[PDB]
Amino acid sequence: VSPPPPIADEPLTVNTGIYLIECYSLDDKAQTFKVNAFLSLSWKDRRLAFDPVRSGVRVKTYEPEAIWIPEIRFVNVENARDADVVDISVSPDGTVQYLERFSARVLSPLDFRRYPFDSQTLHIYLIVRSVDTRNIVLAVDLEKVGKNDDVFLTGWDIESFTAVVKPANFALEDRLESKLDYQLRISRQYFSYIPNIILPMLFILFISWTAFWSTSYEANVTLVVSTLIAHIAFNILVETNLPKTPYMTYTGAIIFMIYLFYFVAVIEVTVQHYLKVESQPARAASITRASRIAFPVVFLLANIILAFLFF
Amino acid sequence: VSPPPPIADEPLTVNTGIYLIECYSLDDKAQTFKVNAFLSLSWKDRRLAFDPVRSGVRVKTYEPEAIWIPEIRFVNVENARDADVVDISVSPDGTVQYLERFSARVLSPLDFRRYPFDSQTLHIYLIVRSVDTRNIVLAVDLEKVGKNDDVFLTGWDIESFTAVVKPANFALEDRLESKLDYQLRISRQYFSYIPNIILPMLFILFISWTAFWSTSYEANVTLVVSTLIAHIAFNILVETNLPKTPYMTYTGAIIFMIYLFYFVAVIEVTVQHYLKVESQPARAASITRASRIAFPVVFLLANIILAFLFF
Amino acid sequence: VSPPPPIADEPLTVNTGIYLIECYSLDDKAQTFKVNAFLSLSWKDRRLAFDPVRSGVRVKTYEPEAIWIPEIRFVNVENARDADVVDISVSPDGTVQYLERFSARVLSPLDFRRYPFDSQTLHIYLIVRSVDTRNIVLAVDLEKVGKNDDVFLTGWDIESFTAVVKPANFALEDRLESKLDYQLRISRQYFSYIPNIILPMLFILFISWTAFWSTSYEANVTLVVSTLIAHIAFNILVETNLPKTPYMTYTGAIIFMIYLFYFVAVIEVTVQHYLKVESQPARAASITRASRIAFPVVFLLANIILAFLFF
Amino acid sequence: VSPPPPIADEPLTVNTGIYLIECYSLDDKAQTFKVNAFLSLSWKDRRLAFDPVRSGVRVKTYEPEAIWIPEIRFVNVENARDADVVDISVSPDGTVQYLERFSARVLSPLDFRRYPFDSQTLHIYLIVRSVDTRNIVLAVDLEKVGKNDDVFLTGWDIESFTAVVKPANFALEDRLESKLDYQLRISRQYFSYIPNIILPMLFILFISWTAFWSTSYEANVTLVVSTLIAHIAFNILVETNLPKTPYMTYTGAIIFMIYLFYFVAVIEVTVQHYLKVESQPARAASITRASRIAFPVVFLLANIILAFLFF
Amino acid sequence: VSPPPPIADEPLTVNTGIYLIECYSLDDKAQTFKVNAFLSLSWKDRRLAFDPVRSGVRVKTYEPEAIWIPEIRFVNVENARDADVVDISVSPDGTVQYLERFSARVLSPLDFRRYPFDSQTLHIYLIVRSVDTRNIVLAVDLEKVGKNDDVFLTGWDIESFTAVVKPANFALEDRLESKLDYQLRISRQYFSYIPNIILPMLFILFISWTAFWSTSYEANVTLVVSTLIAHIAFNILVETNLPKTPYMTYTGAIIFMIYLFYFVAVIEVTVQHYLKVESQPARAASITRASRIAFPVVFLLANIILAFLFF
Ligand SMILES: [Cl-]
Ligand SMILES: [Cl-]
Ligand SMILES: [Cl-]
Ligand SMILES: [Cl-]
Ligand SMILES: [Cl-]
Ligand SMILES: [Cl-]
Ligand SMILES: [Cl-]
Ligand code: NA
Ligand code: NA
Ligand code: NA
Ligand code: NA
Ligand code: NA
Ligand code: NA
């Protein structure tokens, strides 16, 4: 079968729609998400047109093999989508109404700069390649774009599912391609990160600062070195949940900065002990008393600077 | 083939049933479970009706391609179910009896608030989309709903498998959809959590409290800091078994609260040492003696408050 | 095609056989195992009967589509088996001899009570559903039941592969079902658990007991707390290899009991230090000397009690 | 269908092109990467030639089954590619223009010597096997070789996608094989390794060197042994991200060398304590003062030697 | 189609060949490896014989459906191979030349006794089952057996790919089976194990022996107990890379033996301290001085004994 013939030099408009049924498996490391949705397609085929009086029927149901169907693909997928045709209905003016239910693993990059207080715009790119007989252009039927109420994405708040109505028409290998952009706006549920990573990480840091109220070098060494090892464990835990980024993330910046605080606390603990052994505890006492104020003040100000730079 | 014609304007009733054969792979993190079951369908097709006297046969067996079969799908699945038709039997009045055996990965959200003393209602949503000729409505044949005795779900007690008999009839993309809710009620086998997570976590906390019977700062620092690191290991272990929730879980609340007890024990150990060095051991002794009662009493009361808020 | 017609009211006997070729991927956590085997089927179809003199041939080879073949399924599988027909041979009396090679992931629950000194009976349930024309019953052809010599299951000793010759005939959705039970008896190769988990776990426990020959509280605290952390690591390691059970396993009981020994050792170390500080080292010496005998004796007796209860 | 007949003894030239759409899942351990691209093929088939005046059409569109298409395969794949034909267009002279969209998991070895400051040349080998009637040779149509702008590879900078225009023609099982080499040049985004592995690893090493400003053996033992354990954690973390190589990687060399620095620091800490106990602290003081300069100087020089040998 | 008829009572010889293209994913734990290769088959079918003068053609190309092809399978696979026919060529005498390209996950057990200095013989078992008309025997065409030069197996040195030319002819379910053994000889690249596991494990052990040059019980306890915990981490790391074996591996023996050295070092450290407290440091000094020689000498000799028993 060949595509429908053009009245004038006009291209063939294929009206599209995506209705999300299930949304799942958003892999932060892979930058992928899995989708289960309806894909609706509509175009006019004058060759399929019929008399309602003469034929008796108001609409004709065809099997995919019986009629011409546009080769519609997704750009940003891993493998060709798993699809199952639900219905094909032809009106007697030749207006075809196609509906399929599909599942695909969509590849969409994420911006981790503000992690875990980040928001994302996931994309689903629909595409059609023009044939030699005719040029095919995609359009959005807004009445056929949406999502089910029950659609949930573990660890995410689904904000909106909309389509950029104007297609990106371009040439690829000397043929017109009509590309449509479907956008799923999400925002991370940061809640769990507070009692599981942030608050624990702060507690161990504050425990290391108790060395500023101790003259016992052996105890101070144990306090600062032990809490530093727990901080290393939290750093490893965080980086296993995230992919390697060519930029600094918000959590990554805080985690990295806290290492500098542990390093300076080791210097303070060392300086204090050296002075005490040198019979200079009065100078050591001045440094330790200053450290009690300096460490929390510099930590608070550095975090204000970080929060300002990132948000 | 077209759907059966309506006598009057009445919709076509498709009676359904699900009989669970195997239940497995309940993934807490993914909020998914795998199912292997029978799906029974029954509807009247007057065009298939025959006289038992004339034809000779009491029932006619057809192949799926030979007759009209309703396009029945699951709402909350990852991918279309893997199905294999078992039987299609037509009675003289045109009553069709369809049976298939399928397997599917069902996406059903879980409520982890009371974890690991939680109960869940897993859902399997059956759905049919109306055609242009006729409107299709789903119904439950209660005699065809059930489960095999051998059906087990590792780490769970299967309570019941029932169906909400009245369908959710609604419009989706200007067509009637008839949705049925099948509910599998389960309750977690909490047993293993007691000797593997809860009891060990309490033992290490109680070991940290031995510092209240010691004047040795170096030993106290080792006791409280070492047990805190073991607590961090249990926290990481627990959160690997669970997905990130925008709410606090029961275990998560206990785990988080225990950090505050470690933090205050570090303060006590620090205060006691500072006072001893300041030649004030009488004041330090009063604080340590109070701590011996305060810590277990505040721990017991805070746990009563938590258990009350969660159950 | 319809099933063979009954001479008298007798059911149609389908003789079965399973010959294991490959056995692999026994997942303890999932309670699944993967199998690759031959499935042989034999039944009489009088409609296929022929004269060897007239036809010339001793046996007739048919393609699956050409003749009636019983819809044979496995009960306890994840998905329908991956099968490939090898041969279909018909004898002059109409006796059909079918052979296929299949692969399936079989779901069979395991009893971990005696782990890792446990034995299991894996099951493969063959099933046939009766048709409206005739009732179909399964039988075992013992000459066609067996396994290849090279059949190995990593970490397991394959003991026997037999079939319960009498089928479980029952009604499911108003139709007769004939179920056969194939049993693969296995026993775990416990060897590796001795140098990798048991012996190391005992060594660290015995190291904690050296604190009974030390008066140094700081060293004792280090000894008992450090070895307890290594015991936590072994507990976490063991529970990653096992699923969560609503009962106590043998290894789980030993692991749990050892926590009580660490807890009492901390109490002893604390009591000894408190008494020494109170200027009562004579009383402390009596407790420490008793502990040197009490700890290994109570450990040995408790293990005899455990081994008796579990075996 | 048979291949096109040769005018003279000349082989049949199949012009090829690969246009990358999506690039993903570069597994360092497996030495694999996943690709989604267009594969364009062009060859002359004089039997398909037609007159544009007589036929009316400028180009003829065929289905794959209708005409002869060369059996084109990838050498370095896991499984045969997942392909879907997009278009087949024949020009009046018989010039066939084939286009398919495919996805494949490509097996290409990586050189980890300079890791994580490494660059790679990923290969995609196209191959055709000659038939008995004719010899088939591959060619590159440079106008049909390229990549989409949006093509990203998490943790990598895509440099170029080019083809080695001259094929590797050879004999395999007494038949000519024409192999083409498509090269994707990439360079690793090392950024993240600096705040996550390298800087932390240096901090813990520098903390171990504070023992050179302490006379307390107990504190020194804690400092050097604790930091060594954190170094073991970083070594284990690094080797989980990398496959086992029969050569030394840059990071592997630095990680290994740092063990020698910890080992010598333990010797220094031991020697210092032995001398102090032997009433020789003046000799011990000379060794510790030298160590304060020797350790950072030898570390800096050894790293210059390593960086020189590796880059 | 039926198999070729026998001139005399001779069986039908199917000449075989395997040419490896890609070798990958050797899973030590699963005892599996993935292969991508050519499978060549050749047999004489007198019914397909033709005159080159009369027909005009020197060779006839057939589609698999058109002619009889032997049902060739692999014994030690997980699932049936993924195959794609490349060519089928018939010579005038009826000699058929079949070629397919396949991919399969091969199940072949490994001997870990000498790990990681082990060598393996991977097996690929080809098999044919005789039909009722004729007996089918397999043969090796040595000119069609080989491997590509680029064939690499991450962490392994590919030594040779040969075939045992004489088949194992046997009876399975009253039918002849002709089995061929293809052997891929590999040897592990042990290099990486030296700087990543062996050298680090020795360093921590040697650090524990510094306690023999210290009279400080508290420091000795820290040294021996801390290094023992790092040894536990290396033991856990090693056993995650290996499957559970009913025998002792070389690395497993060394790892286990080192526990005994840590245990005896704890006894030495305990005995030394007990004697010092008992005012017997002269006896303690004799034991510690002996230990300085005994520990490295017994370690070196025990390793010579182990290396002798294993190689
Ligand atoms: Cl697609
Ligand atoms: Cl479905
Ligand atoms: Cl099945
Ligand atoms: Cl391919
Ligand atoms: Cl050549
Ligand atoms: Cl050739
Ligand atoms: Cl196979
Ligand atoms: Na079509
Ligand atoms: Na139908
Ligand atoms: Na059939
Ligand atoms: Na310590
Ligand atoms: Na073709
Ligand atoms: Na065939």
Author numbering:
A (entry chain B), B (entry chain C), C (entry chain D), D (entry chain A), E (entry chain E): 5 to 315
Original paper wording:
At present, the best structurally characterized pLGIC is the G. violaceus ligand-gated ion channel (GLIC), of prokaryotic origin. Each subunit consists of an extracellular domain (ECD), predominantly in a β-sandwich fold, and a transmembrane domain (TMD) composed of four helices, labeled M1–M4. However, the GLIC is a pH-gated channel, activated by lowering the pH, with a maximal activation at pH 4 and a pH50 around 5. We instead found that proton activation is a complex multiple loci mechanism, with the key contribution stemming from the coupling interface between the extracellular and transmembrane domain, with E35 acting as a key proton-sensing residue.
